[PDB]
Design a protein around this ligand. Structure first.
Ligand SMILES: O=C(O)c1cccc(/C=C/c2ccc(B(O)O)cc2Cl)c1
Ligand SMILES: O=C(O)c1cccc(/C=C/c2ccc(B(O)O)cc2Cl)c1
Lengths: 116, 115, 115, 116
């Protein structure tokens, strides 16, 4: 699994479940092309977005749909989404975990990058 | 000052100085139109981006050029930039501070919205 | 103002107002001796804790009473309090700001140390 | 596993490996009694600190030795340690993950609490 997304809820102290995630990759014309999408499981994890073959070098954007998540809990949050933009695989294949910790008016994101 | 941006450095324990910041407003066709920009000061702050008259309700994006900041310090970073996307809403408090705390492989952002 | 404490609320997007803060200094027998305390202001800030003369090198602990803050808002929190423990060092920059961003099950803290 | 500690490094984008962790429990006389200790593995996780039987109701302090961690990387950090203090098991047994994300002058901690 070359790209995994994990989302946690800082209000409830739990995984953030059923969070929609859309991944985009910058094309040669500088536009953001849809790359993969999914939603977090009961563990707050999203697996299976892509494959080693498909996940080539590029600039990727991981958009985490935080607003939809919060509204369903009765909270009117600040942000539209959390966006995470990074260059991937420019020194060869790596495995990326993109993690996000969510609050209604704040979020934090970190990456764990490992070499297979 | 309806919109202020503040940036801090979690590696050095300091304001993040001379960081480029660009603000965009979402247009009717869903594209991002340049709205305001500047560089953070010695206190890590960027004031004077807009005025009450110009800062109407709508969706805004604040892009913070974190990659260039880390590169200038000789530190290899993860993100191309930090992006903060939010709706300005007239019912809520009037002044928005978008703050960001930067590390090479992580960032955190919060909004302080007050009267 | 060699030591300032600033507290923000990640749920409401606001300063954390009227939060009790206690500062302790580590004594020679390893016990924590009360040093200074106060409540955060309407801007989430606590100034005037100590003076240059009194704030000598040593290990300090800042305890932020987060549990009472959340309980007053009707929100069930995880932590008893947030604790920030650090060494004051004379070589470094002179003014210390200990900042904390609070959520019910999480908190983040940073130091901004400047001249 | 009723209590697990996970530590990540925000400078390197990796697990924080070999981080010492000491857990204390408040005694009846209000002193902090040593409860369990260990260090994080290659995954940044510390398992096996305690058992369901031993981990009774109480106020617990998880002290993560961040200063020692950073000095070994050549960084003179701000904090002595990160302390995480919480009441546990007061509504019956729960499973607790205490996570911490470390930078030289900052750290963030969150808890994931689940009901077995
Ligand atoms: O505190 C922040 O700023 C922060 C930011 C972004 C992510 C995280 C959480 C990471 C995490 C990753 C995996 C597990 B796991 O179920 O083993 C648990 C946790 Cl908490 C914490
Ligand atoms: O993102 C985190 O994890 C984080 C952690 C700890 C503190 C902060 C906030 C810093 C701050 C400091 C001063 C002002 B100010 O009123 O000029 C505003 C802000 Cl938001 C953000």
């Amino acid at each position: 699994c070359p790209l995994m997304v994990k989302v946690l809820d800082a209000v409830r102290g739990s995984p953030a479940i059923n969070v929609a995630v859309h991944v985009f990759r910058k094309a040669a014309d500088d536009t953001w092309e849809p790359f993969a999408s999914g939603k977090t499981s009961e563990s707050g994890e999203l697996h299976g977005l892509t494959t080693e073959e498909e996940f080539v070098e590029g600039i990727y954007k991981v958009e985490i749909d935080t607003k939809s998540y919060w509204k369903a809990l009765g909270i009117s949050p600040f942000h539209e989404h959390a966006e995470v933009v990074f260059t991937a695989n420019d020194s060869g294949p790596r495995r990326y975990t993109i993690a996000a910790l969510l609050s209604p008016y704040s979020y934090s994101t970190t990456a764990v990058v490992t070499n297979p």
